[PDB]
Symmetry: C3
Subunit: 421 residues, 3 copies
Amino acid sequence: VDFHGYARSGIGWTGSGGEQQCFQTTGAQSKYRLGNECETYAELKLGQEVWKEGDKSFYFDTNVAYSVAQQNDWEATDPAFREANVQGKNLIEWLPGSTIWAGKRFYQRHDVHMIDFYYWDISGPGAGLENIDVGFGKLSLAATRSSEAGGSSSFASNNIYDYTNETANDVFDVRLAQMEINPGGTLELGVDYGRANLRDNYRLVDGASKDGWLFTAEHTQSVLKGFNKFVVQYATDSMTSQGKGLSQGSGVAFDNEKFAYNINNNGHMLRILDHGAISMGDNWDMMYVGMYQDINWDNDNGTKWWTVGIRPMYKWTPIMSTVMEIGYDNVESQRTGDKNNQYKITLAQQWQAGDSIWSRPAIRVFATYAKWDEKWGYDYTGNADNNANFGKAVPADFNGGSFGRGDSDEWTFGAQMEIWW
Amino acid sequence: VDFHGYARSGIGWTGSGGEQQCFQTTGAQSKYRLGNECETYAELKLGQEVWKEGDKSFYFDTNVAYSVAQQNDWEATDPAFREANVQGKNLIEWLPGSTIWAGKRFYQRHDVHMIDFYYWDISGPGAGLENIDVGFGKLSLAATRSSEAGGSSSFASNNIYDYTNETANDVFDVRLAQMEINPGGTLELGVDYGRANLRDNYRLVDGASKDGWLFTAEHTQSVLKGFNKFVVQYATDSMTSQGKGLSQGSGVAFDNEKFAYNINNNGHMLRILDHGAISMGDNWDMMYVGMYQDINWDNDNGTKWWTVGIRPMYKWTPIMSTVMEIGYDNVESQRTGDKNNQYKITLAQQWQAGDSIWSRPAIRVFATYAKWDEKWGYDYTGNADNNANFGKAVPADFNGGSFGRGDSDEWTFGAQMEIWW
Amino acid sequence: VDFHGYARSGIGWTGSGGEQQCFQTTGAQSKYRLGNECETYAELKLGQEVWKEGDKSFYFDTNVAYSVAQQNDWEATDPAFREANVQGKNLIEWLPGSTIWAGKRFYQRHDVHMIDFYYWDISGPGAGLENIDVGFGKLSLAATRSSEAGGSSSFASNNIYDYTNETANDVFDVRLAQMEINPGGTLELGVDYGRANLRDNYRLVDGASKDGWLFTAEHTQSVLKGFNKFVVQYATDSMTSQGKGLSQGSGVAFDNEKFAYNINNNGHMLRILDHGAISMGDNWDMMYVGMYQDINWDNDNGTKWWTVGIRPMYKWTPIMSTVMEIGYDNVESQRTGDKNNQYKITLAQQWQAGDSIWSRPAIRVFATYAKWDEKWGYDYTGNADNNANFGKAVPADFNGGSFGRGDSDEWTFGAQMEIWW
Ligand SMILES: OC[C@H]1O[C@@](CO)(O[C@H]2O[C@H](CO)[C@@H](O)[C@H](O)[C@H]2O)[C@@H](O)[C@@H]1O
Ligand SMILES: OC[C@H]1O[C@@](CO)(O[C@H]2O[C@H](CO)[C@@H](O)[C@H](O)[C@H]2O)[C@@H](O)[C@@H]1O
Ligand SMILES: OC[C@H]1O[C@@](CO)(O[C@H]2O[C@H](CO)[C@@H](O)[C@H](O)[C@H]2O)[C@@H](O)[C@@H]1O
Ligand SMILES: [Mg+2]
Ligand SMILES: [Mg+2]
Ligand SMILES: [Mg+2]
Ligand SMILES: [Mg+2]
């Protein structure tokens, strides 16, 4: 039995009092994670190669995930059963090296570690034919499923409160990877087509996006004992709200009282991203990100987000290091033109298993400082039935209220482990 | 650590739109499973032989089961903790080869794979003394527990709404197996006695079945590189509603609003079943079932169910096959005499680990067609307080309503893995 | 992968009817467990040494716990994710042999097996530096976290119903162990300081304990092939309600309707405990406890509890034994001066893996008799809003009601396994 997974767990304090607090910019889809993670999260994977004859094999893999508040010993939770799939490798003679698979799977996910941000993730229930050797690269085909909680009506209606039936969304994914385009440099291209897939006689609200595309281009360059990844993605309509390869064609969301409201996602997203991790000598490693993400919707409630950060690591010893993370977010509301910004600074002393910035496990002792200035926020007051602005970006002081996190400061400290195995 | 279990997971589409739909006859207790399974289901077993001295050993076994809708990646659920037991083998010198056990256990279950139907299952919390060598066969004794959600009142009452206290049911099970009765043929006999087991001063509703028996006879014949099982079972009163060896003596059920209603199970069940799996040459395997099950209740709301189906497999290659499944159900309401029927046809291309129809894992690509014609259904409209017919079989058009699945067609397709290890 | 854990599971009957019932004295914090455990409880631990170079290593450990009613096969539950931590051993050159750790962990827990009673348990999310070699002993430092469900208000208020915000409690723990003080005798000393840790501008109710101390002294003596532990603990204010090393500074509790009520824990607790397990020849083992615990609160609602019990084991054979357990509880309400008492007698035939009273797994067949006489109980009628006495000790016949378990008898029997591996 193969035992693999991911986990993080710790204990933290907020400088002004109480348990650790974590700092994310209103409107940003990520935060700089170092010394800024407020939950115990674990994935326990049990897998096995259950049959092997020569070059041919079947591999079975599972994944059970737990997320708890880490404020107590006994923390009862609903585990998420995320993966259960079988991979059949080298079973098709005319397509040597290629894998056939079906089941729930984390399918070739692309992320930026330091902000824990997945930018290409179509994971879910699915099936496909992977790694077809096409001479100048590897071709992979897959179909995966996601579902919105409501969005569909069984009868013709102009009332959005009738659109409460779950709507399956399908994604069809084609990727062509490992194209050697320059010395030490590979290129990967992907296309995703996603669409709401309605039951017979069901309908989406008038104007629903329904379907959409996501186009990806990723260049990977071997540099300074590490790598650089330069990414450009462009998404359309139904693919803009999740933004990582899953479709949300219904354009319907629900408040806490189960009232439906319209979040039409017609429009486009442009994401330009560069990240990597490099070594400078034998004492220094560094991770870095810079990203510009523009989500432009027809309803005007999109966002324009810039991020940049660095995470240098100084190795005193093969297992002991000093790690620092500096991260900056700036988010502009499309609706109001206001801007939200934050800069976060973390200092950590770390013991890790190996001398790389990728080495895990790691035990950290840290101190974090964040300073933010938010001039807008989302209006989630009342409910969607009472409030016509429910879910719209709004200036910080709209109607005498307070929206967004204001203009303030805070520091946290504590200890944490992180591991993948 | 031994890692074992069962899992199935896939992605599917309904021809008229939306996610895969699965087809079961109203009134039947099973469906033809090939290309007709609409959830991700997994049992993860971790066990260990924790002590061994010579012939003597203790084995520890567990089982955590997950069932999710396979419509999304993150699917939070309540896992069922189904097994946790210790088996002590060869500990009693005067009963060589026998096992003593206690804990929650899947105890000698008998099922028909292709319709995923358990016909002899008393699994639950329990204890027993298994495999006593009695010369001409093996004798096993066990006691297991189940519990109805309500059914018991703490005081004398004529109001069925007072019978809301959980009622434990005990089953006492004696089996005599492995009797060689003919060349290549074994016989197994079993008796189950089950009864509601009331707390001091609690009561069942007047007329409650209370207790009941289940008698089983199974003949196993080695034929054509596989087997044939011919089964006859007869159950009485409290053993008829579950019908696999667990008792439900209280005869009380609850609607969604927690209103109690009477489902007295006085009466009998006769089940005549034949199933097996045979090989025809080196290229053909086949599974087959035929069953007749008559549940005759004093209240007239029983059923009379006929099933038959076959699942031939053509082996093109040692790992690649074409599998087809054809299944037919016919259910007659005891109450009205109407009939519900369905025929399902599935075609699949499959890659599996081995050249048997029992070989797992298996990756399937399938297409399923079902056609049904239902003239009756159960009335679950209103609640048990408003509706005197709550839970009764009822003609399809009763009182201008629509009951059962009507007279229609549908086709589905998709991909799926199944594995036991 | 290392597979470790704890589990118990069985089936039982109550002499007067229905499923097994378990017997605990009102006011006691424990019960004599043999033949007196009414649930299936399991901890499944998966761990791994993920990196090792010479003397240095990192160990990763997890723990998922399940507790179900063992009344049915399919028992869906919320597993508790109790442990997820990394232990870095021998990483600090100037502190040889010491371990640095962070994550959720069962930290050096001290319990009395036979009454399943933890007397020193600060487990939870935490971090620390363990086993510092200090010449004449081992020094350990740790900080762990716990949280009360409510207790904090965001604004100044005299209304206890406003104090509904969770309040983090921190515990700082220092232990000095393994001091050889006499031949075959070790001494361990510990100090815990715990305090409610309020968010900025939040408050506790007027008079809240807020913080407190727990002082522990444990002497361990090697005797008669086993051991004797003699324990003295003294706790103050916020450390008295949980009583094992976790703080509950807020002094606020909630009824079932979410009404807050005051359980101020100002006062002190004195615990004097002696327990051990000894061998008498080759045929006899015995576990025993004696404890006096006095919880003296300023509000008068504390308790004074005496327990004593013994568990002799007669070994007929290396794997087969006859086990008996006799246990007595006596609890006096501080408020009324009434006394609750119970004596429990259990007889079991057992098969176990090894010839010790500590050997597991064990398969038991038992009969239990309990006789109790309770002259007081806690008033949990109405809710905290209607009832001024909510939660107070009260004479058995207070206001014509019935409080406590009365004056009665009962016997149970069944089978059970228990294992740790
Ligand atoms: O698939 C990535 C996706 O998973 C989520 C949970 O829905 O994040 C969790 O899982 C990740 C590993 O699979 C971790 O990186 C992350 O810390 C954890 O919360 C989404 O947030 C993420 O986009
Ligand atoms: O004990 C069989 C019994 O389990 C149920 C769930 O209550 O079926 C689940 O478990 C079986 C394996 O233990 C699978 O065959 C089945 O697919 C799964 O749903 C009952 O349906 C069944 O009678
Ligand atoms: O840490 C001990 C603490 O855990 C509890 C559950 O909250 O007990 C459970 O876990 C123990 C093992 O970790 C078992 O000994 C016990 O039987 C089980 O209920 C608390 O009751 C106990 O104080
Ligand atoms: Mg402005
Ligand atoms: Mg008719
Ligand atoms: Mg739940
Ligand atoms: Mg009195």
